[PDB]
Design a protein around this ligand. Structure first.
Ligand SMILES: Nc1ncnc2c1ncn2[C@@H]1O[C@H](COP(=O)(O)OP(=O)(O)OP(=O)(O)O)[C@@H](O)[C@H]1O
Lengths: 66, 278, 95, 65, 175, 82, 107
């Protein structure tokens, strides 16, 4: 359930003339790519991810001091 | 730097193929002798009323006998004292008083004084010395006044047993042995898209694009008129631009990538197509 | 009282458009008025002669444009035809 | 009947109308799409009576009446 | 520049490549001025069928967009037919005279592949004798029972009028 | 489009014009100057003439166009109409 | 019915209706087109602007915030096209351009 906006498609590129987006072409492959990945996790990463909230929703960490 | 045009090969040039005449006047009378030998109910004269090329023949063959443009031309010579009127391909395109039966840009017949002489040339060159059924084509969603005038010319001028109108693209569908599909037909006057469901046209929702081969020729003429800007010493006819389009144009697969790097110097000698003039 | 018309308010509006913080004297006002009058008579006259030359009894925008092409020199004429075409197009659109 | 032609509503990729190359920007004086500065030079010094013929070839000339 | 070059045209501009080509300029000869070069007109003129509103300013839709509008937005919404994508996509073929261009069916196939859902058995082909099959179809149709049940005789023209329509499945709608 | 033609106004022709104008001695730099002046003149006249031709939607420049051009330029010409 | 002026529809300032009246009752033609008054008004307004602009510049040069005939004269006699347009026109109280020949200059 992870989502990223890559850009605005180049068919709707010249709708206006000085919009500010990243105009990328439509991908010339499948729409449903199915691939499998073997991937490792160390138990210390489990320890850290269960102790403190990490990375994703930890927005108060931009202060820095305490 | 002399390199980009030192080892460049000599050009391979193509002449102009203008739609001229051709030296044939056949009074073909060998079709009526075969037509009167068949049993009745199975003899009919089929006329494709094409905007670029009216075709006509008998139904029991495979190739049409006459394939002419709707060009006609009439004259009067005072140095000879005689009225001329010939039509079809017999016009040379030296004199030209050419007016066409079809309105320029739309496949709806509205020049009936030309269409009458075109049909006259058809019935003369097929051989009529005296009454066969007529199967004739028309355009999609034709205007009623044009059909009324065409039927009036068929019954009142010539005298015919029966005629029946049909859409020529749907005839080419029925000959191609299809049952249900999406006939897309790009004609000389307009490009039709017609859905057909079990040998029946769904004409309540067919859509015609207003572009065609005549529009190809006219737009090609406009772009060669505006490309060669300072004045080109040559007669730029529409028909020679049509013959340029017929043998020097192709739809590119991926257009926005092919187009932007087309006029680069590296390899322009093989993209470029060159045309002489006398 | 017999009111006498003038182009004063119009050239004033133009003045405010091109130079919002400048003024205009009465003498120069009359000069500008006489100027606009003179050019009006010139263009309308030449347009009239154009209409008469081609056996026409109607002065359309075409006659005015040709007259401007004949009277005003060079770039002045170009911009004039430009502004004129813009105005007649915008007038044609907005009924 | 004969009113089955349909228009569109979609972003159009605007190309040049002097040449055929893809052109990203137009002009105020003559309203011509143009590719680069050579075509801009040939636009700004073309003889009069042709800057309207390019819009005639593209359409929407809007000639006077 | 000569002192720098000693110390150290047309080939730069694209307008000479656009009008004349990579060869040098015309010296105003006999068989050189009377030449027309074609570069962009090969792929710009047959492209108006797909992008009409931009190249030539005809304010209508492209062929791909018309085909997609009919296949995806009208035919599933029409009652009386069974399968809108599973039947009409079995045979989409190209008929007319303005079709015998190199790579014309493949462009329409890629456009419909971009529009249709994944897995539709799209098979675009063309007719056998594209400029002559319009005559042969009415040649084969001319003397059948449906044609015999769709003729207009002379007395039917005298009685019913002029604008009388035998409603055949190929002709237009009756009125 | 031909070549030059500004040299068509040859030296003895300009000399003739000066003779009819009452000129005894002519400089060498007179001829080029005269060619320039004549060029400017003909440009100014032909421009307006072609303008009149275009307004009449004609492809042939008539004599009356020239007469009108000269008249509006301030040099009325008799013997052609108007 | 909420009337609006023809000058507003044409996006101009100069009176279109007034120009139309003058053309009609000015003995120029029997009939006059509908594009003629807007076109003529546009040309007059444009020329007006071109003079007033340069006149404002010449006024700014003399540290004056009111355009006087002198500024108009300086504006017209410097613009070659405008000068040709008003070659046979004498501007009252405009004076002449400050121009002294090189021969008359001190040795
Ligand atoms: N080899 C070819 N390559 C490309 N185009 C061709 C070729 N041969 C013919 N054409 C084109 O086909 C067109 C003629 O089509 P055709 O005569 O079949 O239309 P039509 O049936 O008369 O149209 P309508 O049904 O509207 O009357 C011409 O414009 C020509 O450009």
């Amino acid at each position: 359930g992870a989502c990223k906006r890559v850009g605005r498609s180049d068919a709707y590129a010249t709708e206006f003339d000085l919009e500010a987006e990243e105009y990328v072409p439509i991908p010339k492959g499948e729409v449903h790519k199915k691939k499998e990945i073997v991937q490792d996790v160390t138990l210390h990463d489990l320890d850290v991810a269960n102790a403190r909230p990490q990375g994703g929703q930890d927005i108060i960490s931009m202060m820095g001091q305490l | 730097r002399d390199e980009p045009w030192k080892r460049l090969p000599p050009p391979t040039v193509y002449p102009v193929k203008e739609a001229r005449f051709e030296k044939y006047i056949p009074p073909q009378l060998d079709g009526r002798e075969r037509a009167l030998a068949q049993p009745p109910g199975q003899v009919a004269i089929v006329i494709d009323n094409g905007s670029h090329s009216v075709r006509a023949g008998w139904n029991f063959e495979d190739k049409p006998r006459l394939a002419i443009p709707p060009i006609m031309s009439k004259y009067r010579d005072r140095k000879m004292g005689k009225t001329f009127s010939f039509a079809g391909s017999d016009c040379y395109a030296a004199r030209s008083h050419i007016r066409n039966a079809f309105e320029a840009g739309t496949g709806i017949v509205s020049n009936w004084d030309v269409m009458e002489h075109v049909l006259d040339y058809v019935f003369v060159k097929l051989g009529m010395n005296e009454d066969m059924p007529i199967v004739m084509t028309e355009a999609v969603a034709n205007l009623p006044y044009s059909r009324k005038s065409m039927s009036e010319i068929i019954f009142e001028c010539y005298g015919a047993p029966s005629l029946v109108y049909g859409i020529d693209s749907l005839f080419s569908f029925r000959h191609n042995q299809g049952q249900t599909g999406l006939v897309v037909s790009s004609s000389y006057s307009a490009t039709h898209v017609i859905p057909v469901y079990n040998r029946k046209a769904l004409l309540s929702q067919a859509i015609r694009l207003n572009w065609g081969g005549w529009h190809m020729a006219e737009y090609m003429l406009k772009l060669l008129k505006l490309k060669y800007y300072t004045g080109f010493p040559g007669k730029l006819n529409s028909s020679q631009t049509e013959h340029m389009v017929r043998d020097f144009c192709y739809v590119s697969l991926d257009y926005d990538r092919e187009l932007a790097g087309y006029l680069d110097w590296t390899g322009l000698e093989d993209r470029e197509r060159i045309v002489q003039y006398p | 009282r017999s009111r006498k018309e003038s182009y004063s308010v119009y050239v004033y509006k133009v003045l405010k458009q091109v130079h919002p913080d400048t003024g205009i004297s009465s003498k120069a006002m009359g000069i500008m008025n006489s100027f606009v009058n003179d050019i009006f008579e010139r263009i309308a006259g030449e347009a009239s002669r154009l209409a008469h030359y081609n056996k026409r009894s109607t002065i359309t925008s075409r006659e005015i444009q040709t007259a401007v092409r004949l009277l005003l020199p060079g770039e002045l004429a170009k911009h004039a035809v430009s502004e004129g075409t813009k105005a007649v197009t915008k007038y044609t659109s907005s009924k | 009947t004969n009113i089955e032609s349909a228009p569109s509503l979609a972003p159009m990729k605007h190309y040049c109308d002097v040449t055929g190359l893809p052109a990203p920007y137009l002009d105020p004086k003559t309203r011509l799409r143009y590719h680069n500065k050579e075509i801009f030079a040939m636009i700004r010094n073309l003889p009069q009576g042709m800057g309207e013929q390019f819009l005639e070839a593209r359409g929407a000339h809007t000639v006077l009446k | 520049x000569x002192x720098x070059x000693x110390x150290x045209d047309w080939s730069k501009s694209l307008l000479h490549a656009f009008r004349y080509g990579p060869r040098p300029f015309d010296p105003s000869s006999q068989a050189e001025t009377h030449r027309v070069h074609l570069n962009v007109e090969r792929i710009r003129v047959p492209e108006v069928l797909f992008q009409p509103a931009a190249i030539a300013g005809v304010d209508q839709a492209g062929l791909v967009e018309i085909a997609g509008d009919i296949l995806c937005q009208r035919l599933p919404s029409l009652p009386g037919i069974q399968d809108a994508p599973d039947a009409f996509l079995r045979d989409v073929f190209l008929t007319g005279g303005n079709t015998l261009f190199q790579n014309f069916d493949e462009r329409l196939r890629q456009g419909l592949m971009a529009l249709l859902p994944v897995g539709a058995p799209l098979r675009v082909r063309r007719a056998q004798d594209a400029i002559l099959d319009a005559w042969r179809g009415a040649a084969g149709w001319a003397c059948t029972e449906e044609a015999k049940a769709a003729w207009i005789t002379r007395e039917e023209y005298l009685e019913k009028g002029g604008e009388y329509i035998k409603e055949h499945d190929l002709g237009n709608a009756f009125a | 489009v031909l070549r030059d033609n500004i040299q068509g106004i040859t030296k003895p022709a300009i000399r003739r014009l000066a003779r009819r104008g009452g000129v005894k001695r002519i400089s060498g730099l007179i001829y080029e100057e005269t060619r320039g002046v004549l060029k400017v003149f003909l440009e100014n006249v032909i421009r307006d003439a072609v303008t009149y031709t275009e307004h009449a939607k004609r492809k042939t420049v008539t004599a009356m166009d020239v007469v009108y051009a000269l008249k509006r330029q301030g040099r009325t010409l008799y013997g052609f109409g108007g | 019915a909420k009337a609006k002026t023809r000058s507003s529809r044409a996006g101009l300032q100069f009176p279109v209706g007034r120009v139309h009246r003058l053309l009609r009752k000015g003995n120029y033609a029997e009939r006059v087109g509908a594009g003629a008054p807007v076109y003529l008004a546009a040309v007059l307004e444009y020329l007006t602007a071109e003079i007033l602009e340069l006149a404002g510049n010449a006024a700014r040069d003399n540290k004056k915030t009111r355009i006087i005939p002198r500024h108009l004269q300086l504006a017209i006699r410097n613009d070659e096209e405008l000068n040709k347009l008003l070659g046979k026109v004498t501007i009252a109280q405009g004076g002449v351009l400050p121009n002294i020949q090189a021969v008359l200059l001190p040795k």
